[model samples]
Each structure stands twice: as C-alpha cells, then as structure tokens.
Target: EVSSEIYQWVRDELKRAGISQAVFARVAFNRTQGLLSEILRKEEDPKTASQSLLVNLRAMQNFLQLPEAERDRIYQDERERSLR
Candidate 1:
C-alpha cells in the first residue's frame, strides 16, 4: 500500500491502457515470484530500483509485442465474450 505518486501513475496508466485489475494482479504476481526473488537473492549487490523497473518494462514490452490493432481486437472480443 505504498500510496505515492508512483502508485498513482500505475493506476492511471492501467486505466488509460484499459487494463483490468486482474491483469495487474497477474503481472504483479508474476513479477514478484519471478523478478522479486532475483532482487532478494542478490540483495547484497542488487540493482537500483530503476534498473529493476527497466527490466520489467522491457519484459512487458516484449510480452505485449502484438500490434495495437491486434490487442484492441482481442480486448474487445474478450470483453464481449466475458460479458455475454
């Protein structure tokens, strides 16, 4: 519950990008179990927070490599299918 400007930015970005809380949870869980462990294990010579964040950003970019049209189509289909 770190209620800081960074948290606000995350929230705003999620909404702006039309990502659901579930997506956030999935990403965060994956990040914590996957990347956070590396951070903790290497705490003595850990990367700076910015470095860690950059790693995540790169991962996200790779994961979301689909074109905007593809993503939009998938999201719209998912919404319609789920709400029906």
Candidate 2:
C-alpha cells in the first residue's frame, strides 16, 4: 500500500526536478500501455494508490533519463502556463 505521505513525496520530488504532473501523465500515457487513465485518477483505495505510485515512479525514471534539453523542452509550455 502506498501512503499519502509517499504519494505527496513523489509529487514534491517531481517539482523539485522541474517535472510537472501534466508532463508525467503525458509521458505515462505514451510509455505505460493503457494505464494512463488509472494513473490520473485520484486515489480511491490502497491498491489503486500503490499502483499509481508505481506508474509515477516509472514515469519519473523515464523522464529523468532523457537529455536535460529534451526534458526542459517537453515541459516548457506546461511550466510557463502554471506560472501564469
């Protein structure tokens, strides 16, 4: 089971890395088969929450492996929109 603390931690870590949840969800859809919708849903139970963390971790790992420029490019628009 994934604790809320851990889930929040993942989100914070992503922000610290200059990654947004929007970009994570987008990349997750591209890489995680049909699991994107599930991942986007709010946590309804322990199992679903745990699964979300797994998918999020995978997304974060994949995003981190990209070149820094590519990562910045992919998330640039979303980041700017969020700042506005």
Candidate 3:
C-alpha cells in the first residue's frame, strides 16, 4: 500500500520534474488510450484495464524524459502560447 509519505514524495518529484498538472493530464490520457488499445487487442476488456494513467502522473514522466533546456523551453513556450 502507498503511504502518505510516498504520495508526498510523488508530488514533490512532479514539481522537481517541472511537470504542470495540465501537461501531465494530457500525457496520462494519451498513455491510457494506448494501454487500453493494447489490452483490447490482446482480448482483454478495455473497461477492466487500469485507468491509473488517466491521471496527471504522465506529465512528470514526460518532463523527466526531456532535457532540462527543452523542458523549460516547452513549458515557458506553452505558458506564453496559452491564454490564461
């Protein structure tokens, strides 16, 4: 079972990774769709497939995968491009 400390650590890591909630949600949704498709192709029930990725965690992974400069660039670029 995940402890409160683990959840806090995850949250801190996400911040350190420079992952915003919006981008994370998008990535998670994409991951979810891909996982669901793969599972369904293998005769598994898509509904039964885990929807854990349908959360904001993907953003953290995405940020971690990107170089620091690229991540910062995209994040700032996205912020500028977006209308708040």
Candidate 4:
C-alpha cells in the first residue's frame, strides 16, 4: 500500500466542517465532483497516481483550515475564475 495518510486527514476534517468532497473538488481544487472521491477511494494503494495529483493533495493538506468568511472568499474567487 502507498502512503496516503493525508487522504484521510482531508476527509475527516472536511466532514467535521460540514464540507462535502464534491464541494471541495470545485471550490478548492477545481476538479471534477468525483475527483476527491477517486483519490480517497483508493485507501489501499495508489502507486499509479502521478506526481501532480500528490502535489495538489499536499496543497490541500496545507490549505490547513480557514475561517468561514475566508473559506467563502476562496470559493467565490475560484468560482469566478473558473467561469471566466
């Protein structure tokens, strides 16, 4: 199995914060709704995942935790950025 502990860290934190994986995919990573799910899905092994995937995963890991207003700001900013 691969070292994917950060996967669960993100999952549990988001769950406690009432944030959905689907929403995080869009708001934080601009990924498909199922993207995080797919990443977290392979709780066993993921030797096939490329570098960029883990890079973003690390980014999200260090995105740490933001307050409501700040998190909302990120969501809106990314949302507009993607739309345009």
What tens digits encode model 3's per-residue C-alpha lDDT throughout 1-84?
112233344355447757655543333333333443442235323244245532323333444456766766665665565536
Which 10 residues in a row give candidate 4 its minimum summed lDDT?
42-51
User: Which candidate number would show the highest TM-score if scored against the true structure?
Assistant: 4
User: Could you tell me how far off, in angstroms, the CA of residue 3 lies in candidate 4 after the best superposition?
Assistant: 7.6
The 10 consecutive residues of candidate 1 with the worst lDDT sum are 1-10
Q: Tell me model 2's lDDT, rounded to 2 decimals.
A: 0.53
Model 4, position 43: C-alpha lDDT score: 54
Off by over 4 Å in 3: 1-10, 17-20, 23-63
What lDDT would each prediction earn against the true structure?
0.47, 0.53, 0.44, 0.65
Candidate 3 scores a C-alpha RMSD against the true structure in Å of 9.7
Candidate 2 versus truth, CA RMSD in Å, comes to 6.9
lDDT per residue for candidate 4 within 43-74, as digits (tens), equals 53336667778666756655655676777666
The residue pairs in collision within model 1 are none
Tens digits of lDDT, candidate 1, 1-84: 121233344455456668664443344333434454443344322133466555554444443555666655655665565567
TM-score, cand. 3: 0.39
TM-score of each: 0.35, 0.39, 0.39, 0.61
**Which candidate wins on lDDT?**
4
